[PDB]
């Protein structure tokens, strides 16, 4: 195995396949990249066994076929550390991969290619393309509401649901839920899968302003996203995602609208004197006004009063302020609408001027 590639054609690809690798590998090989020269192409792959990222680089310069694995961060740091424009010559030499450029030489430990784990292959059931920014919007809109380490493993990830011509993501961790949906402009089969939260994060690593569209393939037990010369694959979580519909507030009869930014900043200042652990704030709604208060174990307190549009009956409800801020930071729009019922029931929050995303937050007891 030999190739010679100029530094800059390697750097992004190496960055990208190093995505799934994070931190302290469990087996050695998982801290390595698989490199394979085949034809006029170098393939680089990084994996954590749950998911993999593969990058392909055209080889215009003389090459010999073969494959091996090498430590991903060291190989990256070497190529990044070489001068801009360096030609990096690589050849496998027994155990050990030689990397040479100018008067610099490196020898890296290898592990045998035949030994790298393959997310072995499978059959797309749904294929479709959309703008990278659209996928990014869907994911950004909901990712914060994914559970992290709930025993209910199917909550630690994000549901991707194609209905009609829309793709919709849903996440929840039992305290709040986020749903976002967007038209993909393509008739799509009704299908839904759960992408593990680390696969969702990686898929986000992957997405970039991008000229290139995203092609998504959904298998029985895998999802694949192709953007330019990168191919991300993740296993899916095999479980039943809760039906989001049943957790929407049934009959929100109270409707509040507010400016999103003034609301967020009022919460953000009240949050300063909220309980550091429980983050409780109290919201009192009354005619065209919202009052937010927070007080902490140290006997400090904050109060913010905001004009809002509201004509419903007076009510008080408590919330974890960081959940409310999360929603407001996700909506980032001009005005928000909150639909309430009573102090012990969830609220639904949306952009007052868009139906793309919706959020449901359960309150705290007063």
């Amino acid at each position: 195995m030999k190739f010679t590639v100029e530094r800059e054609h390697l750097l992004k690809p190496l960055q990208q396949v190093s995505g799934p690798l994070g931190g302290r590998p469990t087996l050695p090989i998982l801290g390595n990249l698989l490199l394979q020269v085949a034809d006029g192409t170098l393939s680089l792959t990084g994996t954590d066994l749950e998911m993999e990222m593969v990058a392909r680089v055209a080889l215009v310069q003389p090459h010999e076929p073969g494959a091996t694995t090498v430590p991903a961060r060291k190989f990256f740091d070497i190529c990044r550390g070489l001068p801009e424009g360096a030609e990096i010559a690589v050849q496998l030499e027994g155990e050990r991969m030689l990397v040479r450029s100018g008067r610099s030489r490196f020898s890296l430990s290898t592990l045998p290619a035949a030994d790298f784990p393959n997310l072995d292959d499978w059959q797309s059931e749904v294929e479709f393309t959309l703008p990278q920014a659209t996928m990014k919007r869907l994911i950004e809109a909901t990712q914060f509401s994914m559970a992290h380490q709930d025993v209910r493993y199917y909550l630690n990830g994000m549901l991707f649901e194609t209905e009609g011509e829309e793709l919709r993501t849903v996440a929840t961790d039992g305290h709040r839920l986020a749903v976002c949906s967007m038209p993909i402009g393509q008739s799509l089969p009704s299908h839904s899968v759960i992408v593990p939260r680390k696969g969702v994060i990686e898929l986000m690593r992957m997405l970039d302003g991008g000229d290139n569209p995203l092609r998504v393939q959904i298998g029985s037990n895998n999802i694949r996203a192709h953007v330019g010369d990168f191919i991300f694959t993740s296993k899916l979580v095999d479980g039943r995602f809760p039906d989001y519909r049943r957790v929407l507030p049934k009959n929100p009869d109270k409707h509040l609208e507010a400016g999103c930014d003034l609301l967020k900043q009022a919460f953000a200042r009240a949050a300063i004197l909220s309980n550091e652990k429980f983050r409780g704030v109290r919201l009192y709604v009354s005619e065209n006004q919202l009052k937010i208060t927070a007080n902490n174990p140290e006997q400090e307190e904050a109060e913010e009063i905001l004009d809002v549009t509201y004509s419903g009956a007076e009510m008080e409800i408590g919330f974890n302020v960081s959940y409310v801020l999360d929603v407001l930071n996700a909506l980032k729009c001009e005005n928000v609408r909150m639909m309430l019922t009573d102090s012990v029931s969830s609220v639904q929050i949306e952009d007052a001027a868009s139906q793309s995303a919706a959020y449901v937050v359960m309150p705290m007891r007063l």
């Binding site: 209910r152 039992g174 305290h175 957790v247 409780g280 007080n295 408590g318 007891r365």
Partner: protein, 112 residues
């Protein structure tokens, strides 16, 4: 929410600020004694004044204030007096506080 308050229904309606300040002066130590029973540091969330007029209409409100403090109560009263009394007699004066709320520690779940 937890309130602590004291009020006097006067023998006869009052019509002058000095009378109202004088009643506030007699109520204050009674509120302090009551509140000290339950919150010896006199730390509160809010305080304010209630005036009830001869037509049995009243006005109250509280505003943020960290302790319970006569000066501030008198200031609030004088503004409420000026301003809301509307030439009526005043039948009752009240001072009160609202205590800082208990910490919110129970996050409900969506019940998935």
């Amino acid at each position: 929410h937890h309130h602590v308050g004291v009020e006097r229904t006067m023998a006869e309606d009052i019509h002058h600020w000095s009378e109202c300040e004088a009643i506030i002066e007699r109520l204050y130590p009674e509120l302090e004694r009551r509140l000290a029973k339950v919150k010896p540091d006199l730390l509160i969330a809010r305080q304010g004044v209630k005036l009830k007029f001869d037509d049995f209409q009243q006005t109250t409100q509280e505003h943020v204030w960290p302790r319970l403090n006569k000066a501030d109560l008198i200031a609030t009263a004088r503004k409420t007096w000026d301003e809301r009394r509307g030439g009526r007699g005043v039948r009752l004066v009240g001072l009160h506080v609202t205590l800082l709320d208990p910490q919110m520690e129970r996050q409900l779940v969506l019940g998935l």
